[PDB]
Design a protein around this ligand. Sequence first.
Ligand SMILES: Nc1ncnc2c1ncn2[C@@H]1O[C@H](Cn2cc(CCCCC[C@@H]3SC[C@@H]4NC(=O)N[C@@H]43)nn2)[C@@H](O)[C@H]1O
Length: 262
Amino acid sequence: DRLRPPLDERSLRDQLIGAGSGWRQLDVVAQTGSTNADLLARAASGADIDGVVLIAEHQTAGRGRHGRGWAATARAQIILSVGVRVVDVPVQAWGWLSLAAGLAVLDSVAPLIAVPPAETGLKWPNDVLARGGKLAGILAEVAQPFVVLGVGLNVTQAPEEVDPDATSLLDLGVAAPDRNRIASRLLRELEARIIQWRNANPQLAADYRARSLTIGSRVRVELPGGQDVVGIARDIDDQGRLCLDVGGRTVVVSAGDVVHLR
Ligand SMILES: Nc1ncnc2c1ncn2[C@@H]1O[C@H](Cn2cc(CCCCC[C@@H]3SC[C@@H]4NC(=O)N[C@@H]43)nn2)[C@@H](O)[C@H]1O
């Protein structure tokens, strides 16, 4: 469209690689299958990917969690993956890492949209929402010693292109979205949260809770088989899992698409 310039690999490099960030390497590609895929294939080849950033202008076979698939239109989103060395950390709290990316995405964009912050938060465990619409999705995938973190931020996507519940920074009150300034600020907020995660900083758990749309509301979790538990989400436990109050007693749950029911 008219509002979708391409990126600048050079600018990003100079702002981030060694200078204003801890990231070691940065590549923009015009088209791949899945940025997660590429960084996994690359680690399985023997390459160290701790610190590597991969950004794509367009992505064709997008990966969602639990099987499903993410959809993209050329230059309309910010689509990236990054590599982190994890084996220095308990194998609990690895799920707390995909959570952490959620916060890095709500932080980077919160100072840009002019919607009441109280109507923006994080849906557990891998969605980001602004007035009911899906703003970005996150996927963490494992390949020890590394984790690969994928973000898909709808910058200028329109909903009638990838999903009817999507919205975007454009549709939220942003006339010119600067994908270079947004990508650069999000890579910084990522780096900040990952270090919190590695040093078991408890500010990570508290801030997630503060900005959760899931916590504090009746929710519904749909499980394979036609199963459905319904409860109020009281807290996240230390593995990154969802504590529910059901008839007074805690049911912990690992994943599932959660449905907010106010
Ligand atoms: N553009 C869009 N905007 C709004 N909503 C959308 C949409 N495209 C699909 N959906 C709806 O998402 C549902 C399927 N889903 C979404 C997620 C969340 C995590 C997404 C991971 C993507 C990143 S991108 C960089 C990296 N590289 C990858 O390969 N994967 C990662 N997990 N599963 C399905 O129901 C659809 O309705």
